[PDB]
Every structure is written in structure tokens, then in C-alpha cells.
Design a protein around this nucleic acid. Structure first.
Length: 450
RNA sequence: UAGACU
């Protein structure tokens, strides 16, 4: 047994057996990260097991470090810097980090793999679960999957440590002069989920000129701003869903529009990726966002203010295909190509081994993602055409309609050899051109400068 | 979009 604070002294030996996948479905706030994880790790070390701990985001990574402080753990994430004598037997990294490692060889032969937030719909995370479950099935490892919302979750309002008041109200997606007093009149601390940084900035600036102390959180502001949510006093946290999971704010209210943009592979005509939306989030995401509050048993009157219903069907989301794209090029030390984790199979109808790439194309694929910063789909389309990483011709030889326009003007690229060409890529992926910043990156790619 | 890494 254990008290609420400390981790349990007793750990089930069942979970360490090779060929065993433990699924830990426990409601948000049940101490899964802060209690259960240290228990496993402690028992991992005494058992002397080569151990992998996986966190979806730097936010979760950081909440893990607090709970594991003082244990001989190797942190391979910019979120945590700590002293390490390279003889550790426990590694901790992010889901996407592990996957890209798998694609780039040779990875420690882990006896034990702990995947926290094992519902994460990120194509790399899905791909990781395929590898992990395949390692378990070969009797090469034991694994634990931890998540409050395991695949098949439908309940947007799970149980909490404290009563939650669920309120449906219209929520502004931009600035507002009037009409939304309840936002600013509320005396406590608010966590507000936003689908984008630009939207986040608009709302943040809006709240500031109302006298409110606002910290903005996103992939770009994490390092300097996250510690501020912990040790400092503030009124609002405006956040992208970098904070969707694991985050521990001392908050009283979540504001959740439950909307976001979604990459979708279109197969009506020539195949391409658009950014569909804004569309409702899945029940799992909503439950995670609501799960940020009602965590404190001492504090009984927390609130979750939301707009609209979730949408479970995300089968048109590109991540199911992209995961298969990644997984089809991941191999086990024995030579087996992994199969998707059970509950996530047949999310799209892809042939067995349809995305396998041979020799040099695989190299290029990986390089297009890691060096090129290109989405999985685009990276795959280019690589599988037999184009090498540095050959940017495909950025200019697309059909007439693939002409990229910015500010209603045809985008011109000045190449590394002084040539002027129109940005007209053979494959369209709205992720490299929709946001102005993303387009600049892609302009640099087309230039020959990435 | 969002995340992850160098």
C-alpha cells in the first residue's frame, strides 16, 4: 500500500513478464504519473531491466521528472537536463523521438517499455505502439500502456478527484470587446485551450488589456514559460494542446472550444493533404482537457466550460495513414516489420506492406522528415518517387493548379544557383504552405537552403 | 494545424 503522496511499495510482478502488455486505464488525476510510474521504475531497476519511458510531450516529460527526481534515469529530451553517467539502464524520451530513432538504428534492446499517454493520435506515437506491441508478442519485452482515455473512449466527462461543474457556453475564437463577461469576472485561475498560436496570441493580448496576468504556452514558448505556470502567480494560461495531457496547473477552470484543424488526405482526384476544419475534437481530447481540473480533492468547485459535442470519427485524419507509412519502414532486430497495435488496426484500408521503401528511398524518407521538416505524407510521396533529399526539382514541376499563392500572388523561389522559379510542387500538403511561417520554411526548402 | 527533435 501507499499514502496519497508517495508511490506504492508493492508492485505487481505480473507486469514485468515478457509477452505481457498491461493497459492501465485509470481516470485523470489517479496518480498514474506521480505515483504509479516511480513504482514501476523502482522495481525495474531492482529487476535490472533495460527500460524505456515514453512521454507524448515535453510537458508530460517534465511532470515525470518531478515524480522521478533522484532516480538514475537518462533524459533524452530538451525538457529535462540532468547529470548522467552513461551507464543508466532507464531511458526517458518523447514518443516521436523514439520513432525517428527507430527509422534512423541501432536502439537498445529494451526488456521493459512504459508508454505514458498511450492514446496519443500523433502518427509517430501510433507507430511506436505498433513496434512496442510487436516486441511484446515476440517475447522480447514487457510493456505498459498508461492512459485515462484508451482507444475506444467515448466519455468526455470521466471521474475526477473532485466534483467538476460542466458548463456549455459559447466561447470566443478571436478577440471580443463585449458579450463575454463570465470570462473576466471569474475570480480563479483559468486554462484556455486554443487550436493555434496565432489564435492564442489574439486571445492573450485581449485578456491582458483587461488587467489579466496571461502566460501563453506552446511548442515555441515552453522553455521560458512553462516553469512560470508552476512557481509563479497568474490568472490565465492560454495554451495549444501541448498541455492537453499530464499538465498539472493549480487551476480552477478549463475553457475548451473543442475545435481544431485536421490534416486530411484527399483521394477525390490527385492525392493531396488539406487542413480541414475547424472541426470538433475527439472525446479523448476533450476528456484530457477537462482532466486538467478537478484534480484537487481539497478544491470542490472547479469548472469545465465547453462548446459543442466531440466527434469520435477521425478516420479521414491523415495520421492513421502516416503511422502506417512510418511503421512499414520500421524493423525489429530479428527482421520483422511490426503490425499496428490491435485497437488501432483498420483505421484506414492500406495493404500489408504497401508503404515499404527499399534501400536509398528509406534513407531519403527519414531525411525528408528530420532534415527537411516535412510531413510524413509529403516525405513519403517524394521519397517513393526515387528523388534524393537534395534534388528540389519536384518543388517546381507540379501541374498548373499546384501553384502556391501567398497574399494572392504567385510565390517565386530564388534557387541556390541564382535561378528564379515558381513554387509549384508536384504534391500538395497544406501543412507546408497554410501558415505563413510554415511557407517561409518551405520556401527555404525549395531554395536549396535546408 | 498541433507536437517532437537537431
Amino acid at each position: 500500500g501507499s499514502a496519497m503522496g508517495e508511490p506504492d511499495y508493492e508492485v505487481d510482478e505480473d507486469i514485468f513478464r515478457k509477452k505481457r502488455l498491461t493497459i492501465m486505464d485509470l481516470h485523470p488525476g489517479a496518480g498514474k504519473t506521480k505515483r504509479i510510474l516511480p513504482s514501476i521504475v523502482r522495481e525495474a531497476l531492482k529487476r535490472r531491466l533495460r527500460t524505456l519511458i515514453l512521454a507524448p510531450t515535453r510537458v508530460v516529460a517534465a511532470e515525470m521528472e518531478e515524480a522521478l527526481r533522484g532516480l538514475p534515469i537518462r533524459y533524452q529530451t530538451p525538457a529535462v537536463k540532468s547529470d548522467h553517467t552513461g551507464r543508466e539502464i532507464v531511458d526517458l524520451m518523447c514518443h516521436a523521438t523514439f520513432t525517428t530513432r527507430l527509422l534512423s538504428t541501432r536502439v537498445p534492446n529494451y526488456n521493459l517499455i512504459v508508454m505514458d499517454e498511450a492514446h496519443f493520435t500523433d502518427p509517430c506515437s501510433v507507430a511506436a505502439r505498433g513496434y512496442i506491441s510487436t516486441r511484446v508478442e515476440m517475447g522480447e519485452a514487457a510493456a505498459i500502456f498508461m492512459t485515462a482515455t484508451p482507444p475506444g473512449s467515448i466519455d468526455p466527462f470521466p471521474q475526477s478527484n473532485s466534483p467538476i461543474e460542466d458548463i456549455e457556453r459559447e466561447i470566443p475564437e478571436r478577440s471580443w470587446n463585449t458579450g463575454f463577461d463570465w470570462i473576466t469576472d471569474y475570480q480563479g485561475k483559468t486554462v484556455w485551450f486554443v487550436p493555434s498560436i496565432k489564435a492564442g496570441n489574439d486571445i492573450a493580448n485581449c485578456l491582458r488589456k483587461s488587467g489579466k496576468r496571461v502566460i501563453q504556452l506552446s511548442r515555441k514558448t515552453f522553455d521560458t514559460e512553462y516553469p512560470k505556470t508552476k512557481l509563479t502567480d497568474w490568472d490565465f494560461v492560454v495554451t495549444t494542446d501541448i498541455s492537453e495531457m499530464g499538465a498539472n496547473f493549480r487551476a480552477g477552470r478549463v475553457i475548451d472550444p473543442r475545435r481544431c484543424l485536421k490534416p486530411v488526405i484527399l483521394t477525390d482526384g490527385p492525392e493531396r493533404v488539406i487542413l480541414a476544419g475547424p472541426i470538433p475534437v475527439t472525446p479523448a481530447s476533450a476528456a484530457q482537457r477537462r482532466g486538467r481540473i478537478g484534480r484537487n480533492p481539497a478544491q470542490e468547485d472547479d469548472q469545465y466550460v465547453f462548446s459543442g459535442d466531440p466527434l469520435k470519427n477521425d478516420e479521414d485524419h491523415a495520421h492513421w495513414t502516416e503511422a502506417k507509412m512510418l511503421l512499414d519502414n520500421i524493423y525489429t532486430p530479428e527482421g520483422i516489420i511490426p503490425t499496428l497495435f490491435g485497437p488501432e488496426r483498420e483505421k484506414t484500408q492500406a495493404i500489408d506492406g504497401e508503404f515499404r521503401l527499399r534501400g536509398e528511398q528509406r534513407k531519403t524518407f527519414v531525411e525528408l522528415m528530420r532534415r527537411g521538416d516535412l510531413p510524413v505524407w509529403l516525405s513519403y510521396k517524394v521519397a517513393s518517387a526515387g528523388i534524393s533529399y537534395k534534388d528540389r526539382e519536384w518543388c517546381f514541376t507540379g501541374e498548373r493548379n499546384n501553384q502556391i499563392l501567398e497574399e494572392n500572388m504567385e510565390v517565386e523561389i530564388w534557387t541556390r544557383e541564382g535561378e528564379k522559379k515558381k513554387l509549384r510542387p508536384k504534391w500538395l500538403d497544406a501543412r507546408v504552405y497554410a501558415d505563413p511561417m510554415a511557407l517561409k520554411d518551405f520556401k527555404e526548402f525549395a531554395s536549396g537552403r535546408k
